[PDB]
Design a binder for this molecule. Structure first.
Ligand SMILES: [Fe+3]
Ligand SMILES: [Fe+3]
Ligand SMILES: [Fe+3]
Lengths: 134, 134, 133, 133
């Protein structure tokens, strides 16, 4: 699971929000620094946290990758993004993780929930997981 | 990291050794039962633990997915295998993980090390990680 | 808690043992699921059925979780074995050493609706040992 | 230990604090890296340089890790704040409550070669607090 020092929303932001990410092999270091092993896949949405919070206010829909859940929200517009795929999944630690870059422009679907006590009071409802992009 | 109740070799066997695995969505349940989240990819080698231990005795080579390591060992023969890929990586828990099946027949490369005290004394050197298949 | 277990299953593993051996032996089965030695653990010498019956007692605020009100205190003192970690500086679970502190105390358990994976025959089950008195 | 830290960095976070506040406050910075309240923690009121100097003392067997011989005992007693968890039945870190036990004791630290991520200016660093006397 996530690093306990972060709320779900804070960990969401670290993984999935980056306006101008460098190459994936570089960009992923910031995430994998907090892990014991390299993440196999990751999408960076080139947007802002505030913007994703606004999408949380869209109509509630079924989560495509969690079909028993209906607290998901789809962006009204396609957003630029950078998807990263781990090239060497046999990596035993995070010192050497190499990623392939996949830029794109897609709608995103996020699950949102009530904030954690450690989350900022500015946003009572926050994104907690990136479900998929379309 | 791995479930602490298992040695590296025991966890290797649970993940990577299955002579007659069912469909991936079924076969992966046995692994994901011990995790909080679904594994993104997994290869089942259709062999036996004893056979992989024997490969550990082959010439020491560089680990293709861990290029600072040279405690890897390549099988002399191709072995039947089942590779599993997570179709819904947005899954938030293990209740609903769906996998695509990829059967094949490939050489395998394992990293091997000295056994853990909790490992059986029958095998002083054991596989501890599946590095890659070729 | 190892994810393959429900909270009730993990409660029973840690806290229900009718006739535990010496602590240094008894604790091995718990610590095998851990990276580091558990600092303290109480084995209640009781049965799961006895504890489920306590879940039917008057609900009280949880002494160690004061925002929760689904705790239940045993009407009587029950035999137990408390284990205290002698070497908390231990860096792994290779040689966890425990002091044995047998006793008889009231216990307070939190009880909740069963997990879908739990037996369907007990609708309400103990899920954590809050404290002993 | 959070993987972003070296053992020495994590040692300093947990165990080096020159003027710690009351335990219930001081422990918050440690427990934020954890899922559950730490049961006990000693803050040595010292500096990292002081502890590195102790690493130069006579190596001894580690009292709580008896297969290890890279421990070092402080020549003198040092001021400290020991914190004991009052509510170990706490199910999360929302309200960890600690009893304050100020004191002055010898300490025993394990010391090792620095991590590649550690400062290159201290070749040998404290990596774990084995015990206090
Ligand atoms: Fe993983
Ligand atoms: Fe993961
Ligand atoms: Fe703990």
């Amino acid at each position: 699971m996530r690093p306990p020092q972060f709320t779900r929303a804070q960990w969401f932001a670290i993984q999935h929000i980056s306006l101008n990410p460098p190459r994936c092999t570089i960009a992923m270091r910031a995430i994998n620094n907090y892990r014991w092993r390299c993440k196999n896949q990751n999408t960076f949405l080139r947007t802002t946290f505030a913007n994703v919070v606004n999408v949380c206010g869209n109509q509630s829909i079924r989560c495509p990758h969690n079909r028993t859940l209906n607290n998901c929200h789809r962006s009204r517009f396609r957003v630029p993004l950078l998807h990263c795929d781990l090239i060497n999944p046999g990596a035993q630690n995070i010192s050497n993780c190499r990623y392939a870059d996949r830029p794109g422009r897609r709608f995103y679907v996020v699950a949102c929930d009530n904030r954690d006590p450690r989350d900022s009071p500015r946003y009572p409802v926050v994104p907690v997981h990136l479900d998929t992009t379309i």
